[PDB]
Each structure stands twice: as C-alpha cells, then as structure tokens.
From Swiss-Prot, chain C:
The modification Phosphotyrosine is found at Y95, Y129. It is linked to Ventricular tachycardia, catecholaminergic polymorphic, 4: An arrhythmogenic disorder characterized by stress-induced, bidirectional ventricular tachycardia that may degenerate into cardiac arrest and cause sudden death. Patients present with recurrent syncope, seizures, or sudden death after physical activity or emotional stress. CPVT4 inheritance is autosomal dominant. There is a cross-link at K22 (Glycyl lysine isopeptide (Lys-Gly) (interchain with G-Cter in ubiquitin)). Ca(2+) 2 binds at T58, A63. The gene is CALM1. Calmodulin acts as part of a calcium signal transduction pathway by mediating the control of a large number of enzymes, ion channels, aquaporins and other proteins through calcium-binding. Calcium-binding is required for the activation of calmodulin. Among the enzymes to be stimulated by the calmodulin-calcium complex are a number of protein kinases, such as myosin light-chain kinases and calmodulin-dependent protein kinase type II (CaMK2), and phosphatases. (Microbial infection) Required for Legionella pneumophila SidJ glutamylase activity. There is a cross-link at K22 (Glycyl lysine isopeptide (Lys-Gly) (interchain with G-Cter in SUMO2)). The modification Phosphoserine is found at S77, S97. It is found in: Cytoplasm, Cytoskeleton, Spindle; Cytoplasm, Cytoskeleton, Spindle pole; Cytoplasm, Cytoskeleton, Microtubule organizing center, Centrosome; Cell projection, Cilium, Flagellum. This is Calmodulin-1.
Curated annotation (Swiss-Prot), chain E:
It comes from Oryctolagus cuniculus. The calcium release channel activity resides in the C-terminal region while the remaining part of the protein constitutes the 'foot' structure spanning the junctional gap between the sarcoplasmic reticulum (SR) and the T-tubule. Pore opening is mediated via the cytoplasmic calcium-binding domains that mediate a small rotation of the channel-forming transmembrane regions that then leads to channel opening. Binding of [3H]ryanodine indicates that the heterozygous channel is activated by Ca(2+) concentrations 4-fold lower than normal. Single-cell analysis of cotransfected cells shows a significantly increased resting cytoplasmic Ca(2+) level and a significantly reduced luminal Ca(2+) level. Residues 1-140 form the B30.2/SPRY domain. This is Ryanodine receptor 1. The gene is RYR1. The chain holds residues 1070 to 1260 of 5037 of the full protein. Changing R7W: Decreases protein stability.
C-alpha cells in the first residue's frame, strides 16, 4: 500500500510521503512500526518540517534505535570535525556547524520524545550510547565559541534542546567519591582515569564519564549564574 | 494605598462621586483636567470592583452618550474590565475579594446597552474608532377618581 | 531661558504687539492681547489666557513676552521627545542593538560615560526602544 | 434620571408605586396597561451582528458608519469576544446561532488573514455548510484576486481540518477534495488527510 | 463524616535532605498526598491553609492555600510518588513512575517553599476512599523508587528505622479543649 511506496521511495517525494504518513497516523500497529522504521531510515539518509508532526512513536523499534545511535555517532563526528577546524586557527566552520545543528537538534528532540521507553529499561548498551551522545552534547555546550553561533541559529530558526536531552539521559547514565574524583580531574584536566588509587583509597570509563558530567555540571552552574542631566541628554 | 478601604467604604464612594464631576468642569485648562483624569484613573485602578459600582451607576449613564471627552473614561473602563474580567464574569471570581452580586451583572448589561448605543451613534472618525475599539473588544373616569380617593384614603 | 525658547519669532511678536497697541506707549488690553495672540496663529482658548494674564489691561511688552514664553514652553517638551526615538539609529523600531546605543552615547555631546550608558540601560539583555528612553526623558 | 436609574435605585418608591396599584385593586378600580438572560441575549446580539455582517457583505458586493466599523472594529470586536469566549460557546440555541454565523461568515468573506481564525471558531445552516463544501471542492478543482482567495481558503482549510481533528452532504465534497489532494505546501494535504 | 486526615508523629519531622514515600491509591476518591508543616489543625480541610502541599488526584489538582489544576487524574491501583528536596527547596509529584507536569510543564509541584520548622508525610482519606500507605520501611517494598528517585539521590523515608513509624490520625469524636488565647472569633476575659 502507501507504506510500501514510502519504503520504496528511500524533494517533492518526501513532502508527498509526509501526507501519507499523516494519513496513516490518523487512520490507525505493525504498519506504524514499519512507517517509523522507514522514517528513521530516511532521516539517516538525509528541513525542520521533515521532523515536524512526529505523531508516530516507535515503542520497540530496536533496529531504528541502533541506527539512531549510529546517527548520533555521525552527528558527533561532524560536530567534532567542525570544532577541530574552528580550533585549528574562520567563522565559516562555526556557521556550518550551526547550520548542521539546526537540523540535528530536530533529530535529538525526536529521540528524546520516545527516550522514556528506553529509560524504562535499567541497563543496556543503549546506556553507553546515551553516555556517548551526552558527551558529544557536552562537548558542543562547553564550547562557548560554538555556542555563539548555535544560539543565533536557534533564535533564527525558532532552554536548550540538547541540554534537555542530556538531562533526561542523566538517570540512564548513572561510589559517591567518583564525583570528587571528577572534580579533581576537572581541576587537573586529565581525560583518563589515571588516579585509580584515589578510588581505591569498566569503572575507569565510568570515572571518565563522571568527569565529563562534572564538566557539564560546571557549565550548567555557569549558565545558572540623572534627572539633573536628563534635559541635557534629551 | 486607597485599595483596602473596606473599613470606611463611605470615603471611597464619596471621592469617586467628586472626581468624575470635577473632571468635566466647564472652566478648565488642558493640564488641569488631564491631571484630574490621571488621578481618577489611578484611584480607580487600585479599588475594590464591588465598591466602584456606586460611581459606576452614573458612569454607565454617562458612557453611552459619549458626547464630550468620552475617550479617557472609555480607556479607564477598559482598564477596569481588564482588571476584573474574571472577577465579574466567572462564578468563582477572584480569591481575595468576595464574588460580586447581580448588581454588577446588570450594570454590565447596561454597559452593553451603551455598546448598542455607541455602536452606530456617530459617523466615521479615525481617532474615535482607534481609541474606542478596546472598550468594545474588552467589554465581555369618575369611578377611577373615586378609586384614587380610595388610594388617598388608604 | 527666554532667549533659549525662541529667537526668530521675536520679530513677529514685536510687530503684532505694536499693531495691537493703538496708543503706542506699549500697553495692550487683555482683550487686545487675546486678539493679538489669535492673529499670531496660536488661537489659544481664553480660559488659559486669563490664567496666564493673572500669573504674569495694563499688559506691557515685557509682560507680554513673558506670558508668550510661558505659553510656548510647553509644546517644545512634547516635540523634543519624538525625534530622540529615531535619532539613535536608522533602525528606530526595536532599537535595542548595542551599536545604536554606542552611536547615541559616544557622540551625545555631553560626554556620557560607558558606566552612565550601563546605568541608562538598567534605568528601566533586551530593552525596548521606548522603555528606556521614557525613563531617561522623565 | 429615574428611568436610567436601576430598580435598586428606585428602591422603596417603586414598591410604593406597586402598593398604589394594589390599593387601586382594593378600591376595585385599577389601571392595567436576568444575568443568565443577559448571557443568552448576548449570544442573541451575536446572531444579530451576524445578520448585520451579512447585510454589510451584500452591500459591499454592490464610508458610512456601518461600513466604517465593519471595516475597522467589527472584526476586532468579534475577535476579542471569541478569544474570551472560545469554549464558552461550545460549553444549544447559542451553539446553533454561532454555527449559523460561522456558516454565513464564509459567504460574507467570499462576498483579513487574522479573520481566518475567527472563521475557524438548522436547515439554513446545513444548506450554507453544504454550499461552502461545494465551493471548497470547486476551488480545489480550479487549483488542479484568485490566488489570494485560494491561499486564504487553504489556510481556512487547515483551520477546518484542525477543528475536525479536535472533534474526534459535506461528506461527498470532502471525499472529492481528498481525492483531488491525493491526485495533486504538503502540510495542508497532511492536515486534510488527518481530518 | 469529616475527612480523616493521617500524618506521622511530630518526632519524625525532617528539616534537611531529600525523602520520598509511595502511596497506593487502591480506591479512587477525594484523596490528597504530600507534605505539611508540623503544626496542622485537624479541623481545616487539607490544603486550605499554608501548612500543607499536596495533589488531589480525583480532580487532577494540587492544593496549597487554594487549588491549582496542575497534574493529571489518577486511576485505581496507581502509585503516587512524593518528591521533595529540602536541600534543593523543591517538591515534585510522581504517578507510577511518571513525573507530573503543571500548566507551564514544569516538573516541580511547588517551588520557593521555605523549610520552616520542618515537614512530615501527610495524606487525607475521603469518605469511601481506601489506600495503602508505604513509608519505605523496606527498600525493596517500594514499587517505583527504582524507576524514579533512585538515580536522583532521593532516599526512602523509613530507610533505617528498625520499628514501624507511628502515625497520628484525627479522631472525629469531639473532646473539650481550652479556649485559645488568640482565637479568631471568640475571646474570654476573667473579671
């Protein structure tokens, strides 16, 4: 039917298929899951209106979740390449990064809309994928130079979607001395968990993620922070 | 500070009678009437809506005619409606002040009678319509002689 | 004061007062003063004219100029404020840009300080075009 | 004036006058010639304004005070009303009057862009709705001052689709329009399909 | 008769930290769940005074010095969570692991609430309403503590108590009590 044509269509074609997706959503299942998978594949292959009206939510896509994890990795790689180009030595790299993040935040919001179902599950490799996605988002957020263009792009497109997505994954990301170790690492700028005796007085990756979370917490704390001459000047 | 005059509501009602009468003085200057109108608006802003009804009785007679200088009273009425729309309309009203009775309801009915009157009272005028649209928008035998003698006797 | 209010209109005022006074001694009646004011072009109401005469039959040229200055001082205050809104920059509407404020302040002519600019901004980061200007105007 | 004055203003004197009539009855010779009601009559005045708007549209199809506030204040007045009383109409004689007014509103517009929202939110009303559906089908066929009217209708089409979604002779016209949309701004088509 | 308000003992008042309990709404009805000040008058309908902060699940409303339409209506057999962080000065309400949202969508049920003398669990049972209240005496007894609160650092109320927590209910039977010196309506003078 229309779902088969949409799957075989993988830009007037996308716009036409969007009305078909809307028709399928109001009419309604297995067809809904197939449509969600096709939409995820199309988004991976490829414009905020495309992510607009995301009525269909995939409860158990599994494969689409893995693709979004690869999609999150690809977005992280693009953002890191843009950041490295900007930090090499001009504003064109920042403009391109902002333009890319204009569409990437739509995918991030789409993932976070249904991330509650994944958050219901206590432990999985999706937790590691969410940790990596949060690390990428924190790398973008802590870069105030990139933020100078990201905020402008967000205002033009029309309190951060990436920050909100990272916050919802905070429960999935998670002794208490790891926080102190993370603070020490932030004070010392040590990427690796070199100080294992401090914890003694797998887990190393958890300590590195805790250091990243401490940096994100520091960024969040920074974010949280005459009549006589009137006639003359007039 | 005038608001909260429930303890001596008589004073609030009296000043309300005097200020509106003084605003329409025959011998006046522009600034002299302007400051009086500003004083009346400021006093009416911070007042209990139920207690304003005594002066609103004359205000709802004066508004429909709109003969002279109706723009400032129209703006004051628009401000009062914007202040107490949910109080006068919704059954719950506002928390602190007690719910107004049907007196204010029929006063608003007379205000809508004035809305009828002023809807097509005058011809086109740019300033008139421009400054009067917010109020409309924010409005929401011998034997008989013997009987007479009997009445006198009664 | 009087010189700073109006300069070019003094010739018209003198001619009107000289024409009004038939005797030429420099004394003009209150009705004659009102007629001269109407001939000038102001056409003010007699209600304010009587108050101005009382505050200032025996009205002389200096008293007449004092009354005219008192009458004409009020309109310039209303006229002055309007131009300041668009004087800051070409983009008068939504003039919240820091460049417009810098152009207005660094070249004000009164040597307004940057700290004074910040105080004006916070007088009452986005500030409406008229919100801060009204507070400054007072 | 007393007539201007309310019954409460009349107070005892009005009662005394009533008493006088009672006294006349005792004599045996006598002379003989609303808050919720206000709320209902206020929608009655809405229906009267709908009739006045229909008359004004008919006249404009062929300056004065009537035309003046029809052009200037009537749309903002009804707009501020229906903004304050959006669900008040919905929660009936008032509902039927509002439906008739909305049905006649499309014809009156046909004869601003913000008036599309006002248009968004009983034999004559049913006939007007059927005629509006037929006109929508005719405009859809024509697509497959005309451009501005078509765009305004497409926006009103989206508003009607949103109203139908909120709800969950015109059926045949709706099916024909859906078939035309399928054969032939994709958000409007998506909204029509959802409706 | 009157609403039978339940609350814990005054000695169990908590003035710092983040604590949580789960209440089972077995039967739907006029029921409210939350915290309250230690000094609570049994006569006042819950939430009319400034003493308590709760959520009415029957009407999907939250009550503190009045009523607010925040929250979604619950169903029979639903677990209502109680979030509060005196360190963070913030209070949230949870329903079967779902964080409630207000009209603006804010997760917090109540904000800018002073610590004051302290807070203690409180719950009202209306006529015909029956529920099962768990104060977290056993960590594993809480159904939805692992889903929400466990990762947020919140702790069960009776985490370390070795004996059941005593609660104070209001006896509808009237008993004579001395006149308050500052009674709002009636005053007495010894002549």
């Amino acid at each position: 039917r229309l779902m088969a044509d949409i799957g075989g269509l993988a830009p007037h074609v996308i716009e036409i298929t969007l009305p078909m997706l809307c028709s399928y959503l109001p009419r309604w299942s297995d067809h809904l899951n197939s449509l969600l998978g096709n939409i995820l594949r199309i988004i991976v292959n490829n414009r905020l209106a495309v992510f607009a009206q995301p009525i269909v939510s995939r409860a158990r896509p599994e494969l689409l979740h893995s693709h979004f994890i690869p999609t999150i990795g690809r977005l992280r790689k693009r953002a890191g390449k843009v950041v490295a180009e900007e930090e090499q030595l001009r504003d064109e790299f920042s403009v391109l990064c902002r333009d890319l993040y204009a569409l990437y935040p739509l995918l991030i919001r789409y993932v976070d809309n249904n991330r509650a179902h994944w958050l219901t599950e206590p432990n999985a490799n999706a937790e590691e994928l969410f940790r990596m996605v949060g690390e990428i988002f924190i790398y973008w957020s802590k870069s105030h130079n990139f933020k100078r263009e990201e905020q402008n792009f967000v205002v033009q497109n029309e309190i951060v979607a990436t920050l909100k997505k990272m916050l919802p994954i905070g429960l999935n990301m998670c002794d208490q001395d790891l926080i102190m170790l993370a603070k020490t690492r932030y004070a010392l700028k040590d990427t690796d968990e070199e100080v294992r005796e401090f914890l003694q007085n797998d887990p190393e990756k958890i300590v590195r993620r805790v250091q990243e979370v401490s940096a994100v917490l520091y960024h969040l704390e920074q974010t949280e922070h005459s009549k006589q001459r009137r006639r003359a000047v007039v | 500070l005038f608001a909260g005059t429930e303890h001596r509501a008589i004073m609030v009602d009296s000043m309300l009678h005097t200020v509106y009468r003084l605003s329409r003085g025959r011998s006046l200057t522009k600034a002299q009437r302007d400051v009086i109108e500003d004083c009346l608006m400021a006093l009416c802003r911070y007042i209990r809506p139920s207690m304003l009804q005594h002066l609103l009785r004359r205000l709802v007679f004066d508004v429909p005619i709109l003969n002279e200088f109706a723009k400032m009273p129209l703006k004051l009425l628009t401000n009062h409606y914007e202040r107490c729309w949910k109080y006068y309309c919704l059954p719950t009203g506002w928390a602190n002040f007690g719910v107004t009775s049907e007196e204010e309801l029929h006063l608003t009915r007379k205000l809508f009678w004035g809305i009828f009157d002023s809807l097509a009272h005058k011809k086109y005028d740019q300033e008139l319509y421009r400054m009067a649209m917010p109020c409309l928008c924010a409005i929401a035998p011998e034997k008989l002689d013997s009987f007479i003698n009997k009445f006198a006797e009664y | 004061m009087a010189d700073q209010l109006t300069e070019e209109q003094i010739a018209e005022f003198k001619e009107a007062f000289s024409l009004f006074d038939k005797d030429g001694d420099g004394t003009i009646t209150t009705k004659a003063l009102g007629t001269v004011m109407r001939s000038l072009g102001q056409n003010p109401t007699e209600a304010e004219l009587q108050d101005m005469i009382n505050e200032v039959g025996t009205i002389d040229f200096p008293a007449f100029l004092t009354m005219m200055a008192r009458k004409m001082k009020d309109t310039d205050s209303e006229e002055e404020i309007r131009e300041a809104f668009r004087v800051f920059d070409k983009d008068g509407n939504g003039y919240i840009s820091a460049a417009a404020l810098r152009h207005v302040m660094t070249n004000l002519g009164e040597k307004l300080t940057d700290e004074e600019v910040d105080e004006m901004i916070r007088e009452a980061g986005q500030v409406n075009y008229e919100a801060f200007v009204q507070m400054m105007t007072a | 004036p007393y007539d201007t004055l309310t019954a409460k203003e009349k107070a005892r004197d009005r009662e005394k006058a009533q008493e006088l009539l009672k006294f006349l009855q005792m004599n045996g010779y006598a002379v003989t010639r609303i808050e919720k009601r206000f709320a209902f009559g206020f929608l009655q005045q809405l229906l009267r304004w709908m009739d006045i708007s229909q008359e004004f549209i008919a006249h404009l199809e062929a300056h004065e005070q009537e035309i003046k506030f029809f052009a200037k204040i009537l749309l903002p007045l009804i707009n501020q009303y229906f903004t304050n009383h959006c669900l008040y109409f919905l929660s009936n004689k008032e509902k039927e009057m509002i439906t008739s007014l909305f049905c006649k509103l499309a014809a009156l517009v046909r004869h601003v862009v913000n008036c599309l929202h006002i248009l968004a939110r009983k034999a004559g009303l049913r006939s007007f709705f059927e005629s509006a559906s037929e006109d929508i089908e005719k405009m859809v066929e024509n697509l497959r001052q005309n451009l501005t009217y078509t765009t305004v209708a497409l926006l009103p089409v989206l508003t009607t689709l949103f109203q139908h979604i909120a709800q969950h002779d015109v059926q045949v016209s709706c099916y024909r329009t859906l078939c035309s949309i399928y054969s032939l701004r994709p958000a409007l088509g998506e909204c029509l399909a959802r409706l | 008769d009157r609403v039978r308000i339940f609350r814990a003992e005054k000695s169990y008042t908590v003035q710092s930290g983040r604590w949580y309990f789960e209440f089972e709404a077995v039967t739907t009805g006029e029921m409210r769940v939350g915290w309250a000040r230690p000094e609570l008058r049994p006569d006042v309908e819950l939430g009319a005074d400034e003493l308590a902060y709760v959520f009415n699940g029957h009407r999907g409303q939250r009550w503190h010095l009045g009523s607010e339409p925040f929250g979604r209506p619950w169903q029979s057999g639903d677990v209502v969570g109680c979030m509060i962080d005196l360190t963070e000065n913030t209070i949230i309400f949870t329903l079967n692991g779902e964080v409630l949202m207000s009209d603006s969508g804010s997760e917090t049920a109540f904000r800018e609430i002073e610590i004051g003398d302290g807070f203690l669990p409180v719950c009202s049972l209306g006529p015909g309403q029956v529920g099962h209240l768990n104060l977290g005496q056993d960590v594993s007894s809480l159904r939805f503590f692992a889903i929400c609160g466990l990762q947020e650092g919140f702790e069960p109320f009776a985490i370390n108590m070795q004996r059941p927590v005593t609660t104070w209910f209001s006896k509808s039977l009237p008993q004579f009590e001395p006149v308050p010196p500052e009674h709002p309506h009636y005053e007495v003078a010894r002549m």
